[PDB]
């Protein structure tokens, strides 16, 4: 940058300390640019990576809270009233051509439970029972399909997204200050307005923006893939969104025309030859995970069963009281 | 200029430019049939559901005694299994209308239950992805192919950089591959389609193009983009000539302008870039859950010799 | 009898006499299991598309 | 302007008239029925004999064919997991029937079938026209 409101351009940060003789080699994740490589010799660049966007994964739920209540608004008791009135209808059809037991028949027709009753003697009740069983099959098949419907059933995509290309207030974008992303954005003219929206929210370190994304103060972040893809594999609540822009690799920054410039360009390649870097990133990079966010809702979390077991947990309690009332009726009449 | 990789065996004689296109050693796999999981969906219903089932099932023996007081030892669970798994097994119902309530609750637990397990299973078996039966060059399949009915056949082109890299790390690998030379990329694809070759090993960029430019888009490469020896392309030049440092600037300027993604329209785009249960014989796990019970039925038969001592 | 097993129900129904009558019901049950699993299949295909 | 192409066939699964996997919709399970009937026969013999398969098929097809439960509990505990296995295979058949019934052409001038030419595709327009 042009500093001291004059004709002087100094190099901030690390590269000025390379230029000022505070060091002679830079061994760090330092990207390769056209502006740094004007007079600073690099090496073969360790890796191949690119820029990518970091966002925060959402909640989305499972259908556990529908413990036998997916449609309990319209999983009506009206069908039970229909059971009762068709029991009354079969009673009247059997009466004026096994009487009080008709509902103990009909529920055993419904729940596929062979509870010990007799068929209706008249055929006019039998033809109703035929289509009643057909209706029972229809509602249980519809319940199965509507249960499957709950269990079978989009974020930003690159710099060509109108959430990001055309700026707004509802999205906040940031990168680390004085970095290569700020160089790539100020170099580009088509992204200049985006950079002008970027100037009021930038941060100073990587961890600052990484913690600030998870506090929902900053909806997105732009950095390299070889750090964000590791960070989305350890702090396992955030996600990337795919494609790359500025494909390069971190190189060793050396002073210009040091005599090691032919040695270190060899040995890096040698370490790429005999399998050293694969041991290195297996030891350091891909050693840990939580779960790859492929967005597969086809999994369990049948952990709790409380709302479906609580009906039998209340049934076991109320049943002894109803048995006591029933035997008090048996003793009375 | 052209397709020309960067390595150490060439860098001794020739000077090189800046690395130019990311590449490496990859492997093209065959176009195998789709596979479901090797087991039935026994994943964690056993953690919570299959263990709550027994302890909420066994509690009705007290009320089964209480209804006969105002048929439980063997008949109760024999009734209570037939309706939870949707079967009209010939089973005598219990006496009295007061016993009829809890079975009518259990039937509603059954209809909720089986429609749940069919639901979760039907969600599971239309979202699961085929898994990559060979992975990495360190596998035993990519080692000496000893124990394999007709064993693995690796393809490579025997003149270039990948041969000189594979001859310095795995001697017996290329010593076995020497019988499986190929004379061209399309001849490698024709040998892979006719069953003559099991797997092919070549550069990453050409294989990633031809994966995207096949007439079908069946299975292509091991993993997604896992390369063995990651290197780059480049532009060879006269050794320590003055014209090196200029192209070294200019290429980086090209990286500064994004014109490779404008040059993508000729370059690597394509069709299908990762965009029947004859294999139902994976049921052997539940067949092992069959025959384990076929062991235990003998075991209990042996412990049915204990009234001979009692 | 022939309605109770095609629509998957344990309605209290006396079976017919003899082992020779037992064959066609055992075919009809296999027609039932093919049937209802078909209609649930087609319906489950229909209501998520 | 737009592009005109020919729609394909694609079929339904009608030709799988109860044969979606009849290679591996095995008769081996019927042999398993027969040998577990032999096993229940031997368990009931050395603790309702010839009728055991008429029991077991009625266990399988959810058809209440008129038999007696095994007297020994060692056959009963096998029948429990046999019914569980029957539920498993019918549920797997339902899901695999749904899998057949739940399961890409060129897109604009930015398609490499059309942008980069070849022999496998032929393109044409009316001569001397605005195209």
State the Cα–Cα distance between residues B65 and B102, nearest whole angstrom. Answer: 13
Q: Is the dihedral of CA B69, B70, B74, B77 positive or negative?
A: negative
Q: How many interchain CB pairs under 8 A, B with C?
A: 4
State the Cα–Cα distance between residues B261 and A249, nearest whole angstrom. Answer: 17
Q: Residue A258 region, left (φ>0) first, then alpha (ψ -120 to 50), else beta?
A: beta
Which three-class secondary structure state does DSSP give residue B60?
A: helix
CA distances from D24 to A72, B195, D20, D92 (A): 41, 24, 9, 13
The CA-CA-CA angle for residues B103, B107, B112, to 5°, reads 145
What does DSSP say about strands A51-56 and A221-224: parallel, antiparallel, or unpaired? antiparallel
Q: Residue A164 region, left (φ>0) first, then alpha (ψ -120 to 50), else beta?
A: alpha
D130 is in an annotated binding site: yes
Using CB atoms, pick whichever of D83, D103, D111 lies closest to residue B85.
D83
Radius of gyration over every alpha carbon of chain D, rounded to an integer in angstroms:
29
For A146, nearest residue in chain B (alpha carbons): B119
Chain C CB within 8 Å of residue D68 CB: no
State the Cα–Cα distance between residues B103 and B84, nearest whole angstrom. Answer: 10
CB B232 within 8 Å of CB B22: yes
Nearest to A47 by CA among B227, B105, D68, C7: B227
Using CB atoms, pick whichever of B91, B98, B255 lies closest to residue A34.
B255
> Which residues, including other chains, have CB under 8 Å from residue B288's CB and lie 6 or more apart?
none
**Length of chain C, please?**
49
> Which residues, including other chains, have CB under 8 Å from residue D37's CB and lie 6 or more apart?
D52, D53, D55, D56
What does DSSP say about strands B236-237 and B15-16: parallel, antiparallel, or unpaired? antiparallel
**Residues of B with Cβ-Cβ distance to D23 under 8 angstroms:** 278
State the Cα–Cα distance between residues A231 and A171, nearest whole angstrom. Answer: 22
Using CB atoms, pick whichever of D58, D85, D112 lies closest to residue B286.
D85
Nearest to B139 by CA among B279, B285, B23, B27: B27
A299 is in an annotated binding site: no
**Residues of B with Cβ-Cβ distance to D78 under 8 angstroms:** 293-294, 297
**Residues of B with Cβ-Cβ distance to C8 under 8 angstroms:** 86
Beta-carbon count within 10 A of B248 CB: 18
Helix (H) or strand (E) holding B114: helix B100-124
A60 is in an annotated binding site: no
State the Cα–Cα distance between residues A322 and B67, nearest whole angstrom. Answer: 12
Chain B CB within 8 Å of residue D19 CB: no
Using CB atoms, pick whichever of C3, C12, C39 lies closest to residue A117.
C12
Paired tokens of B272: 């299908």
What was the experiment behind these coordinates?
Answer: cryo-EM
Paired tokens of D44: 């009931």
State the Cα–Cα distance between residues D113 and D122, nearest whole angstrom. Answer: 10
Q: What is the secondary structure of A64-125 as a DSSP string? A: TT-SS-SSTTTS-SHHHHHHHHHHHHHHHHHH----TTHHHHHHHHHTT---S----SSHHH
| Residue C24 distance to chain B (closest CA, Å) | 17
> Which residues, including other chains, have CB under 8 Å from residue A163's CB and lie 6 or more apart?
A156, A171
What does DSSP say about strands B25-29 and A8-9: parallel, antiparallel, or unpaired? unpaired
| Residue B77 distance to chain C (closest CA, Å) | 18
**Length of chain D, please?**
131
Chain A CB within 8 Å of residue B269 CB: no
Edge to edge, what strands does the sheet with B199-203 contain? B25-29, B199-203, B154-155
State the Cα–Cα distance between residues A224 and D96, nearest whole angstrom. Answer: 43
| Residue C11 distance to chain B (closest CA, Å) | 9
Using CB atoms, pick whichever of B45, B101, B252 lies closest to residue A33.
B252
Paired tokens of D82: 């046999």
Chain D CB within 8 Å of residue B55 CB: no
Nearest to B205 by CA among B186, B170, B230, B188: B230
What is the 3 state secondary structure string of B203-248? EHHHHHHHHHCCCCCCCCECCCCCCCCCEEECCEECCCCCCHHHHH
**Residues of A with Cβ-Cβ distance to B11 under 8 angstroms:** 265-266, 269
The CA-CA-CA angle for residues D68, D69, D71, to 5°, reads 115
Which three-class secondary structure state does DSSP give residue B164?
A: helix
Interchain proximity B109–A308, CB inside 8 Å: yes
């Amino acid at each position: 940058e042009r500093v001291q409101n004059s004709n002087k351009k100094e190099w901030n940060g690390m590269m000025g300390e390379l230029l000022s003789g505070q060091a002679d080699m830079i061994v760090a994740p330092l990207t390769i640019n056209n502006e740094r490589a004007q007079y600073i010799e690099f090496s073969k660049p360790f890796k191949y990576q690119g820029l990518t966007i970091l966002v925060k994964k959402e909640i989305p739920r499972s259908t556990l809270d529908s413990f036998m209540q997916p449609f309990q608004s319209t999983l009506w008791l009206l069908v039970g009233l229909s059971v009762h009135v068709v029991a009354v209808m079969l009673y009247l059809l059997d009466r004026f051509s096994t009487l009080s037991s008709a509902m103990w028949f009909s529920w055993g027709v419904l729940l596929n439970s062979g509870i010990g009753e007799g068929a209706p003697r008249s055929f006019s009740a039998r033809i109703l029972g035929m289509v009643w069983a057909g209706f029972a099959m229809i509602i249980v098949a519809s319940y199965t399909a509507n249960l499957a419907a709950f269990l079978v059933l989009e974020r930003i995509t690159g710099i060509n997204d109108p959430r990001l290309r055309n700026p707004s207030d509802k999205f906040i974008y940031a990168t680390v200050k004085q970095s290569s992303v700020d160089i790539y954005f100020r170099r580009q003219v088509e992204l200049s307005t985006m950079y002008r929206h970027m100037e009021k929210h930038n941060y100073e370190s990587a961890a600052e923006a990484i913690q600030a994304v998870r506090d929902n103060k900053l909806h997105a972040f732009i950095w390299d893939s070889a750090v964000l893809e590791f960070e989305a594999s350890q702090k396992c609540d955030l996600v990337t969104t795919g494609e790359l822009f500025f494909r390069s690799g971190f190189g060793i920054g050396m002073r210009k025309d040091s005599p090691w410039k032919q040695q270190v360009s060899l040995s890096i390649l040698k370490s790429h030859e005999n399998g050293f870097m694969e041991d290195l990133d297996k030891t350091w990079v891909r050693y840990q995970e939580c779960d790859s966010r492929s967005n597969a809702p086809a999994t369990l979390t049948c952990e709790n069963m409380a709302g479906v077991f609580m009906l039998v947990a209340g049934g076991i309690v109320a049943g002894i009281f109803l048995i006591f009332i029933e035997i008090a009726y048996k003793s009375r009449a | 200029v052209g397709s020309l990789t960067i390595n150490e065996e060439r860098s001794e004689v020739v000077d090189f430019s800046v690395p130019f296109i990311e590449t490496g050693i990859s492997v093209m796999v065959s176009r195998s049939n789709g596979t479901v999981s090797p087991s039935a969906f026994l994943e964690p219903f056993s953690a919570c559901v299959w263990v709550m089932m027994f302890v909420m099932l066994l509690i009705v023996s007290a009320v089964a005694v209480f209804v006969f007081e105002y048929v439980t030892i063997g008949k109760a669970i024999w009734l209570l299994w037939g309706l939870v798994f949707n079967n009209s097994v010939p089973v005598q119902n219990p006496k009295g209308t007061t016993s009829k309530i809890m079975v009518s609750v259990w039937a509603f637990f059954a209809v909720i239950f089986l429609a749940s397990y069919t639901a979760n299973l039907a969600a599971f078996m239309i979202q699961e992805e085929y898994v990559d039966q060979v992975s990495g060059l360190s596998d035993k399949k990519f080692q000496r192919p000893n124990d394999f009915s007709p064993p693995f056949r690796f393809g490579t082109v025997p003149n270039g950089s990948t041969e000189r890299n594979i001859r310095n790390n795995y001697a017996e690998m290329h010593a076995y591959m020497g019988k499986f030379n190929q004379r061209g990329v399309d001849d490698a694809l024709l040998s892979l389609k006719t069953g003559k070759l099991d797997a092919f090993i070549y550069d990453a960029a050409v294989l990633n193009y031809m994966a995207g430019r096949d007439e079908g888009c069946k299975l292509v490469t091991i993993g997604s983009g896992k390369v063995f020896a990651s290197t780059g392309y480049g532009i060879a030049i006269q050794k320590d000539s003055g014209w090196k440092r200029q192209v070294d600037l200019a290429i980086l300027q090209l990286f500064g302008d994004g014109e490779m993604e404008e040059l993508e329209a000729l370059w690597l785009t394509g069709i299908c870039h990762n965009e029947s249960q004859l294999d139902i014989d994976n049921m052997a796990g539940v067949f092992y859950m069959l025959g384990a019970a076929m062991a235990l039925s003998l075991i209990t038969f042996i412990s049915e010799h204990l009234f001979y001592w009692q």
